């Protein structure tokens, strides 16, 4: 329906809008060039947007999720991060609410995803 239209939707309900959010990330110059600061300042902002985009893509590659909007892993979920029931997580809560609740544990999760993929690629190469 629009960018962030699903922000108030439940986590499950918002899953089919992941594509709109992705499309909007990369979405009189004869005068403006003359202003050195205007030029540099705005160019830097554009460059940073690119850098952020690429870092997230780099991570999806590392975790083995680059080809999917939704990516299952072999890393188990820890009750330390969350011991809430899936029915509340997916049907009642929104992503804004839910994500805030696990803001401590994100780094832990990322490290686990990276290692799991590392071992799986090794296993494939040894098998071949």
């Amino acid at each position: 329906l629009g960018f962030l239209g699903a922000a108030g939707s439940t986590m499950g309900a918002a899953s089919m809008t992941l594509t709109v959010q992705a499309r909007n990330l990369l979405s009189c110059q004869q005068h403006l060039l003359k202003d050195t600061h205007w030029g540099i300042k705005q160019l830097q902002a554009r460059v940073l947007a690119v850098e952020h985009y690429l870092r997230d893509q780099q991570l999806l590659g590392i975790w083995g999720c680059s080809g999917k909007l939704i990516c299952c892993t072999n890393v188990p979920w820890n009750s330390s991060w969350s011991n809430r029931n899936l029915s509340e997580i997916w049907d009642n809560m929104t992503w804004l609410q839910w994500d805030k609740e696990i803001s401590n544990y994100t780094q832990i999760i990322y490290g686990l995803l990276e290692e799991s993929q590392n071992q799986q690629e090794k296993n494939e190469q040894d098998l071949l």
Binding site: L1, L4, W98
Partner: protein, 440 residues
């Protein structure tokens, strides 16, 4: 039983600061710089079942607006002629031609030496000056007030500085959120919010004491400050209806120009046609009185049921904070406000005439290392502005408190238009427990 599933494109965000890009609807300075066109698209998304917290007193956009404005102002002046060749002794006497008692010594007829197109030649000229910009040296010897402290640059006469509405637009990866709660005071949670592509068109209006040409409150009068209890805070008042103010400089000025160098033209005030009288501004007494009565009722809601509101003028300081200021027709006005703040509120119609002063050497933007000369404008100037708000300060359980108009950062004016907007960064990744396991 559960595994970490990665979700990309998740509709969430975090508080953020980023540079915004300036766009106009479309040879004015604002328009020349803020030349990026806006979209013909009133894009807004209602964030149904989303609550967000706003705090206008911490809003980064105000600081950016300020910074960009200062930069533009200077950029406009960078290619203009310097008047430093004119930092000479002036031989001044009082003007007595058709001058009334409310003027007397305000105008001076000064003569001086200045340069010419050729380096070796000099010329003698006569010019009319306002007392505010001329200082006695010690007799008849006077100088321009700022030739001791800073260089004076003449603003280019061809450049229009009148404000145009400006829309600020988010860079990709960012979004502007807006509070649509009509009763929102700028600091609490807001439960009626939507996304924004670009802000509305905000005019970069500059004034002191009274706010001009801003938005009006739907909800009568809203009085807000970072902290009401704190006696050091400057209170902003937003009105639901404007008060019109009619400003003028009645004198018909004759403008002439002389070269001081090959591409350097100096514009001088010349002389005056007709009678010489003070500049002034008018408002309706009742309109002003009705407005204050409502403000007082709103003040009691914060200051007490038996509280008596005493209005008074500012406590002191320089011209820039003791008078109301604006730039009507491009001339800089410094108008008295004591006529607006004399009464005490307790628990075809007459107008209020505010006398005004005219100044040409301006220390712009609360800075002191720069000065500019405002070229005089030929003829007679009139305009009418919309007073949309107040800039107020206040001075042992007396039950009576005193409120005064005052100065402050220009940022404080801009805080009003930007009070309803917030900048956030979009964060597409997150994870969640699910019952799937990656196929091995």
């Amino acid at each position: 039983n559960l595994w970490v599933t990665v979700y990309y494109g998740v509709p969430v965000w975090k508080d953020a600061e980023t540079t915004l890009f300036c766009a106009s609807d479309a040879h004015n300075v604002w328009a020349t710089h803020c030349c990026v066109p806006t979209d013909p698209n009133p894009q807004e998304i209602h964030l149904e079942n989303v609550t967000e917290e706003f705090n206008m007193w911490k809003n980064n956009m105000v600081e950016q607006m300020h910074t960009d404005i200062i930069s533009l102002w200077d950029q406009s002046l960078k290619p203009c002629v310097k008047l430093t060749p004119l930092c000479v002794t002036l031989q001044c006497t009082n003007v007595t031609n058709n001058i009334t008692d409310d003027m007397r010594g305000e105008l001076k007829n000064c003569s001086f030496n200045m340069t010419t197109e050729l380096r070796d030649k000099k010329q003698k000229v006569y010019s009319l000056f306002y007392r505010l910009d001329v200082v006695q040296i010690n007799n008849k010897e006077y100088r321009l007030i700022n030739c001791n402290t800073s260089a004076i640059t003449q603003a280019c006469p061809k450049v229009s500085f009148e404000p145009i509405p400006i829309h600020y637009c988010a860079p990709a990866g960012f979004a502007i959120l807006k509070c649509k709660d009509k009763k929102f005071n700028g600091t609490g949670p807001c439960t009626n919010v939507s996304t924004v592509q670009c802000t509305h068109g905000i005019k970069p209006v500059v004034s002191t004491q009274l706010l001009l040409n801003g938005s009006l409150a739907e909800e009568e009068v809203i009085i807000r400050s970072e902290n009401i209890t704190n006696n050091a805070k400057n209170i902003l008042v937003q009105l639901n209806e404007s008060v019109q103010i009619n400003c003028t400089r009645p004198n018909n000025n004759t403008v002439k120009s002389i070269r001081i160098g090959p591409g350097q033209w100096f514009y001088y005030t010349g002389d005056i046609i007709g009678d010489i009288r003070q500049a002034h501004c008018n408002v309706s007494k009742a309109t002003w009185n009705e407005t204050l009565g409502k403000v007082v009722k709103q003040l009691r809601k914060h200051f007490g049921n038996n509280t008596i509101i005493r209005f008074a003028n500012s406590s002191g300081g320089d011209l820039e904070v003791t008078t109301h200021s604006f730039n009507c027709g491009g001339e800089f006005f410094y108008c008295n406000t004591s006529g607006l703040f004399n009464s005490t509120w307790i628990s075809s119609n007459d107008s209020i005439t505010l006398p005004c002063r005219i100044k040409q050497i301006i220390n712009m933007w609360q800075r002191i290392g720069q000065a500019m000369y405002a070229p005089p404008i030929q003829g007679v100037i009139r305009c009418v502005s919309n007073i949309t708000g107040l800039i107020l300060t206040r001075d042992t359980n007396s039950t009576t408190e005193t409120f005064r108009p005052g100065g402050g950062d220009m940022r404080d004016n801009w805080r009003s238009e930007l009070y309803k907007y917030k900048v956030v960064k979009i964060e597409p990744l997150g994870v969640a427990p699910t019952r799937c396991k990656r196929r091995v």
